[PDB]
């Protein structure tokens, strides 16, 4: 399957992220997000795509396996933990990745969200490291939709 | 509880907008409730389309959600699309408030897809119009929302 997520939020920060399930156990994720402060910004899929209350109603990190926060490449990680994304000097974050635990059929209807700052991939030894990665505040989210 | 919920915030090319929530009471009953404002008073077709891609506004949503390859019809017709929710009447203040059940539309089907409100009435495939058995000829799409997974108000 194929998907897309139109990000946005309070003021700056907004972009587009598409998902394409190339095969039954590996997914391609490509997207661009402008308006971000140069530097790393965590990226995660949250349980819901309900933006009624903006990104506050998006629920928490999509985590079916009941794991703990981790890195994309980590094993013990939330299915929705896409780790970080780097916003170059221009404040533009462009990326492409092949996460193989996050499937298009498992995240449609949900949401993609970028945070204030860097995700410490559950290794920051902060009360929130193992929970969110202490990525800070959610500044942009989009509902992961079905696409052609 | 196993009550699946989905919410669809409507936004578009015009004034029209609202929120429609979906609730899968039982596997055969899906409560659909919503309020859409900014509509001209009168009937307005409501359908679930196959894609939720709003990258090209309400155009990239594709067509009405129609797995069974049926033709367009009213919400109560057997020969209809799964996403055919039929009409929705916006009152004098240009507001559409509606609550209804649909036993053919399942929450788990429409997630990720989109809810669209049309310019005009849905002839429910009986207009004898080239588009009747396709779109019900409900006119143009003035607003659409991406059906999203939701907690649901309990
Ligand atoms: Zn996480
Ligand atoms: Zn139809």
Q: Ligand 2 centre from B58 Cα, in Å?
A: 15
- Tell whether A106 lies on the interface with B, counting CB pairs under 8 A: no
Task: Give the integer Cα–Cα distance in Å for B93 and A78.
Answer: 46
Give the closest-approach CA distance of B128 to chain A in angstroms: 30
DSSP symbols for A67-125: -----TT-SSS-TTEEEEEEE-TTS-EEEEEEESS--HHHHTTSEEEEESS---TT-S-
Q: How many CA atoms lie within 13 A of B52 on its CB side?
A: 33
- Among residues B102, B107, B100, B112, which one has the least CA distance to residue B147? B112
Residue A32 Cα, gap to closest chain B Cα (Å): 13
User: Tell me, what CATH number does A129's domain have?
Assistant: 2.60.40.200
Shortest CA distance from B108: residue in chain A: A109
Resolution, rounded to a tenth of an Å? 2.8
Q: Give the ligand at the shortest distance from the Cα of B118.
A: 2
Structural domain harbouring B62:
1-154
Interval between CA B127 and ligand 1 midpoint (Å): 52
Contact A93, A32 (CB under 8 A): yes
Q: Return the number of CB contacts < 8 Å for A and B.
A: 69
- For chain B, the three-class secondary structure string (H helix, E strand, C coil) is CCCEEEEEEEECCCCCEEEEEEEEEECCEEEEEEEEECCCCEEEEEEEECCCCCEEEECCCCCECCCCCCCCCCCCCCCCCCCEEEEEEECCCCEEEEEEEECCCCHHHHCCCEEEEECCCCCCCCCCCCCCCCCCCCCCEEEEEECEEECCCC
Q: What are phi and psi of B110, to 5 degrees?
A: -70, -10
Kindly state the DSSP code that residue A32 receives in the 8-state scheme: E
Which of B19, B147, B151 has its CB closest to that of A109?
Answer: B147
Domains contained in chain B, number: 1
List the beta bridge partners of residue B102.
B30
Residue of B86, B96, B112 whose CA lies nearest to B16: B96
B133: nearest Cα among B66, B52, B61, B42 = B66
- Gap between the Cα atoms of A69 and A119, Å rounded: 10
Question: Strand order in A26-34's β-sheet?
Answer: A138-143, A111-115, A39-46, A81-87, A93-99, A26-34, A14-23, A2-6, A145-147
């Amino acid at each position: 399957g194929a998907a897309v997520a139109i990000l946005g939020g309070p003021g700056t920060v907004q972009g587009v992220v598409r998902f394409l399930q190339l095969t039954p156990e590996r997914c391609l994720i490509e997207g661009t997000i402008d308006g971000l402060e140069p530097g790393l910004h965590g990226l995660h899929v949250h349980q819901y795509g309900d933006l009624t209350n903006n990104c506050n109603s998006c629920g928490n990190h999509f985590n079916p396996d009941g794991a703990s926060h981790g890195g994309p490449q980590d094993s013990d990680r939330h299915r929705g933990d896409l780790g970080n994304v780097r916003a170059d000097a221009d404040g533009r974050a462009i990326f492409r990745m092949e996460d193989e635990q996050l499937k298009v059929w498992d995240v449609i209807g949900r949401s993609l969200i970028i945070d204030e700052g860097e995700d410490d991939l559950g290794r920051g030894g902060h009360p929130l490291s193992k929970i969110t990665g202490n990525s800070g505040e959610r500044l942009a989210c989009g509902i992961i939709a079905r696409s052609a």
